């Protein structure tokens, strides 16, 4: 619309200039200082300059009013706020620095730019890129059956911020699932287990159908929290300071064998197997507690006329 | 012959993408899931895939359309039967 009118005005100006140049193709000889129209010319120039300055001042006042309202500070202001509220940003073009966990996780490598966008209630809307979907573990034991081998048919405030958090969560979940899979496949013959692309189940003893499973959009909560905390504590330990003086850069348990002779203690205090085995033996403890409770209930129901045995758990 | 030719093209296309995605997911299982458990495979330039089992009773499995039967989906083959 306005582009055509602007082009027509520019063409008219160019034609006028070309005609003037052709007529010319300022010159004294050798053989607006009027003080009447110069006044009006200076007045018009001052008016135009005042109008331009007023427009610039209006733009500056609008910018200052937009900066005053701390609700739409998308002009690299809320961006700095989130930068101080989130991880670093190795800016290639505008923003990078995903939850790569290359300093806190130390797991399946996944790094790169994740969210660099500045556009628009009026949030910047950081793009969540790339699982981009919920994924969590679900566990229960109700009429378990070892017979399996079927498909994975599941029986199941800032918005971009929690979206990015859930993205980091599902990323670390995928990482730990890959880790547990590598452990189950590279382990010795301590116990057999079943490993599928997304569903895992072991059998350390009869009637142990541990129903831990990686879900995704494509007891019942405590054990998964325990597993997550143990794996993240493992990673944290993989990252205490070594207290280095010359160049230990290790753990004090290594140097403790020098003064304090440890035939097998130092071997046991160095590192051990964990992950699937610890969760498995935790489930074993759980089923043992269940069997003890069942024995107590059976004694109460059957040996009722008998002396009523009384138990009390520890703390 | 639009019907037969279009069917041929779409069929070879889907089988090619299927074998490619199979190869890629097996390579992913090698890199991520199974280090050397099933890290044995040998296939041609295309239209055929084959892999082996753990080494020391070693067997092998294979899948290929073989371009002989237009209705044969995968033709899963393996020397020791069930």
């Amino acid at each position: 619309d306005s582009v055509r009118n602007n082009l027509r005005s520019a063409l008219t100006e160019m034609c006028v200039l070309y005609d003037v140049l052709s007529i010319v193709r300022k010159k004294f000889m050798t053989l607006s200082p009027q003080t009447l129209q110069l006044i009006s010319k200076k007045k018009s120039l001052a008016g135009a300059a005042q109008i331009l300055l007023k427009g610039a001042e209006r733009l500056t006042k609008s910018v200052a009013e937009n900066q005053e309202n701390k609700l739409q500070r998308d002009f690299n202001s809320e961006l700095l706020r989130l930068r101080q509220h989130w991880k670093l940003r190795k800016v290639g073009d505008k923003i990078l620095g995903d939850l790569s966990y290359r300093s806190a996780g130390s797991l399946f490598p996944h790094h790169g730019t994740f969210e660099v966008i500045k556009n628009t209630d009026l949030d910047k809307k950081i793009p969540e890129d790339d699982l981009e979907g919920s994924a969590y573990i679900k566990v229960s034991i109700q009429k378990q059956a070892p017979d399996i081998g079927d498909l994975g048919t599941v029986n199941l405030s800032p918005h971009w911020q929690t979206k990015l958090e859930a993205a980091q969560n599902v990323l670390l979940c995928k990482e730990i699932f890959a880790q547990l899979s590598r452990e189950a496949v590279q382990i010795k013959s301590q116990i057999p287990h079943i490993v599928v692309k997304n569903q895992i189940i072991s059998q350390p003893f009869p009637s142990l159908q541990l129903s831990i499973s990686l879900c995704h959009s494509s007891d019942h909560l405590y054990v998964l929290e325990h597993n997550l905390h143990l794996l993240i504590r493992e990673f944290h330990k993989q990252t205490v300071m070594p207290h280095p003086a010359s160049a230990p850069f290790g753990h004090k348990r290594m140097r403790l064998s020098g003064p304090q002779a440890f035939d097998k203690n130092e071997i046991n205090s160095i590192q051990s197997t964990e992950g699937l085995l610890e969760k498995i033996i935790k489930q074993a403890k759980h089923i043992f507690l269940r069997s003890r409770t069942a024995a107590t209930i059976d004694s109460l129901a059957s040996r009722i006329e008998d002396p009523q045995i009384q138990a009390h758990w520890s703390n | 012959k639009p019907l037969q030719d279009m069917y041929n093209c779409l069929h070879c296309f889907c089988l090619s993408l299927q074998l490619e995605v199979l190869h890629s997911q097996t390579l992913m299982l090698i890199r991520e899931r199974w280090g050397d458990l099933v890290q044995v495979e040998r296939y041609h330039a295309g239209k055929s895939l084959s892999l082996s089992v753990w080494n020391q009773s070693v067997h092998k499995v294979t899948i290929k359309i073989d371009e002989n039967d237009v209705s044969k989906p995968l033709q899963i083959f393996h020397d020791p039967p069930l």
Partner: peptide, 23 residues
């Protein structure tokens, strides 16, 4: 998401070869 860094870097070549064979 339209990056060819995925298997499309090779899937496209496979498609091209398959079509050149069929034509």
């Amino acid at each position: 998401k339209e990056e060819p860094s995925s298997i499309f870097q090779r899937q496209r070549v496979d498609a091209l070869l398959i079509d050149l064979r069929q034509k």
